[PDB]
Ligand binder design. Structure first.
Ligand SMILES: OC[C@H]1O[C@@H](O[C@H]2[C@H](O)[C@@H](O)[C@H](O[C@H]3[C@H](O)[C@@H](O)[C@H](O[C@H]4[C@H](O)[C@@H](O)[C@H](O[C@H]5[C@H](O)[C@@H](O)[C@H](O)O[C@@H]5CO)O[C@@H]4CO)O[C@@H]3CO)O[C@@H]2CO)[C@H](O)[C@@H](O)[C@@H]1O
Ligand SMILES: [Ca+2]
Length: 147
């Protein structure tokens, strides 16, 4: 109203891996992983792996983080979607806003948070598949919207 601002670049992986860092060389944008559109992100099983992007959030602002994910077989651990940054306080507090997934059917989760007055480091959006079973992880439509 009149627009909703989304802060995630290439949120649906429709531009492949554009804008996303592939930390463990274990990511591909493939039709297999799509929940919407032509592509989704597949993070390959067998080792902990993930990727992410840096996001310039505004201070004192309400954001909604949301994502769709599923594992293609039962995981031991989880796949986590995280917004993280440091505060500029005495303890340099590291803040993490976390969605945890372990489902084998496509599942949507979301959370709301409000950013501080000042950031101690540039916010990062992390897609972290910490599970080490053979399960592949699909994730799609990762949104971070200002309201
Ligand atoms: O690989 C080369 C590449 O590395 C980049 O650095 C990456 C690195 O590769 C990743 O391994 C690393 O992954 C970390 C995630 O970013 C971060 O979100 C995650 O944080 C954990 C946290 O440690 C943990 O305490 C927390 O537990 C919560 C549970 O999830 C909840 O269920 C429960 O209720 O509460 C607890 C406590 O809050 O979970 C979160 C989410 O999993 O830790 C990951 C590592 O274990 O990210 C690095 C980037 O930040 C590097 O930048 C590149 O330059 C390089 O090329
Ligand atoms: Ca998609």
């Amino acid at each position: 109203g009149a627009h909703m601002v989304n802060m995630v670049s290439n949120p649906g992986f429709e531009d492949g891996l554009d804008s996303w860092q592939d930390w463990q060389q274990d990511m591909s944008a493939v039709p297999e992983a799509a929940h919407n559109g032509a592509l989704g992100l597949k993070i390959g099983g067998g080792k902990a792996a993930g990727g992410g992007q840096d996001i310039p959030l505004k201070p004192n602002t309400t954001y909604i983080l949301g994502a769709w994910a599923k594992f293609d077989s039962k995981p031991a651990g989880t796949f986590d979607v995280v917004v993280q940054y440091h505060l500029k306080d005495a303890n340099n507090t590291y803040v993490q806003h976390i969605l945890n997934f372990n489902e084998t059917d496509w599942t949507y989760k979301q959370l709301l948070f409000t950013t501080p007055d000042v950031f101690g480091s540039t916010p990062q959006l992390a897609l972290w598949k910490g599970d080490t079973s053979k399960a592949n992880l699909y994730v799609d439509d990762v949104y971070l919207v200002e309201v």
